Each structure stands twice: as C-alpha cells, then as structure tokens.
Design a protein around this nucleic acid. Structure first.
Length: 174
RNA sequence: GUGAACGGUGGAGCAACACCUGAAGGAAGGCUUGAUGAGCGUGUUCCCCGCAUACGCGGGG
C-alpha cells in the first residue's frame, strides 16, 4: 500500500550533509585554498539522473531530506503521542532496552546471529508498531518503506513519474 | 662403418547444475553580520643621532 505525503515547508530545511565543506563571503562553494575559507555545513543533497537537455540525462544535485531522518521522525511521532500514551494510560512499563529498541531499532550494537522462532516473527510483524519498524536483537524486517523527502522540482522529474506536471520548481532552491 | 642403422604417444571427451548480501539505524544538538576604523586640545627655539668635518644637511620627543 502506497502513501504519498505531499508537504510544503514553512521554514527553511537544514539536514546537514556530512563533510568539511567551505564557502567564501560571496558564494563560491569549496574554493581553492587561500581565499579565507569559512566552514559550511551544506544541506543534504541527492544526486538524481535528470533531463538536462533534449535527449541527455545527467546526474544533477537535488536537495532532499534522507529517508532515515523521515523514518525516525515517523517512529518518534507515533512513539511520542500514540504509543507511550497507550502504555502509560494503561500503566505498562517498557524496559530501558525496550525503550532503546522501540526508539532506535536495537537495544545494543550487537545483533544475535541466531534466528528467532516463526511464531515470534509472525506476532511482531502482526504487531502495530513492531511490524512497521523491525530490527531488534534478531534483526526483524519491518513492513514500512520510508522514502527520502524529494522536492517538487524538474530535477526530480524522473523521480515523480510525471504525476505532477504543474508547480515544478526550475531554479535553485537553496 | 658410434650393439649402429630405422621407429609420432597417439586418437576422443562441456566443470557443470542451483543459490536475494541482507535485515535495523535522525547529522545533529547550540551560535546577533555586527561592528570597527569617519568629526573633536596645544602657538616658538629646548634635548640627542648620523653624513660631514662644521659652510650645513637629514632626523628622535
């Protein structure tokens, strides 16, 4: 089942791309050394194959938010005000490892190499929260598939599948 | 006139069949482009340093 959540950002988006990048006072991202470089945390960018001219496809930049950030955000909002109220209005007490595995998919950094029983797998994939986000010590596969947040941009023209032919941003978005 | 002289290791044959690199995972917490350099007081011959070599030049406060 496919969900397409079209959102519009009200304030600027800053998902910091890792990397020691630098900037001059008048632009010029990553200059040659000696022009008094300033530290610059660029926002997250996905390279996307796109139509640059008639019959030519090139790997253009397109500024996105990664799907891991979105996946943890969805996990965090359901945990913050659908799952934890369902546990503390009923007085249920999750363990600290249970809290760690709920909020981050694992309790420790060492998954078990042994597989879990099939009844356990069926119960957790039939579970409302654990079915969405798997993992755990025995590495359950979740049912949820969270894509990265692309903008409605012509650079993402091959991403959207021509679902939206309007509202297509052409110029730079940064 | 080498116990020599002469003498083909040959023909043919499938390394091949099947196999998910995969499950989970927040780039983030904090951070004034704002200044800084733009205008505001002294009223006449007093020390010391070099070039000279004193006829004078440059010069410290």
């Amino acid at each position: 089942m496919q969900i397409e959540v079209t959102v519009r950002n009200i304030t600027p988006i800053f998902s910091a791309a890792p990397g020691s990048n630098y900037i001059t006072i008048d632009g010029t991202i990553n200059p040659p050394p000696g022009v008094s470089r300033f530290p610059l945390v660029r926002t997250r960018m996905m390279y996307v194959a796109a139509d640059v001219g008639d019959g030519v496809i090139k790997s253009v930049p397109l500024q996105i938010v990664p799907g891991n950030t979105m996946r943890s955000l969805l996990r965090r909002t359901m945990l913050k005000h659908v799952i934890e109220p369902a546990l503390v209005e009923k007085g249920n007490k999750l363990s600290i490892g249970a809290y760690a595995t709920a909020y981050s998919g694992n309790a420790t950094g060492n998954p078990d190499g042994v597989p879990s029983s099939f009844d356990e797998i069926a119960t957790m994939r039939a579970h409302p929260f654990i079915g969405l986000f798997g993992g755990g010590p025995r590495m359950l596969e979740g049912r949820l598939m969270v894509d990265s947040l692309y903008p409605i941009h012509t650079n993402a023209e091959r991403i959207l599948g021509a679902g939206y032919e309007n509202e297509m941003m052409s110029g730079p978005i940064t």
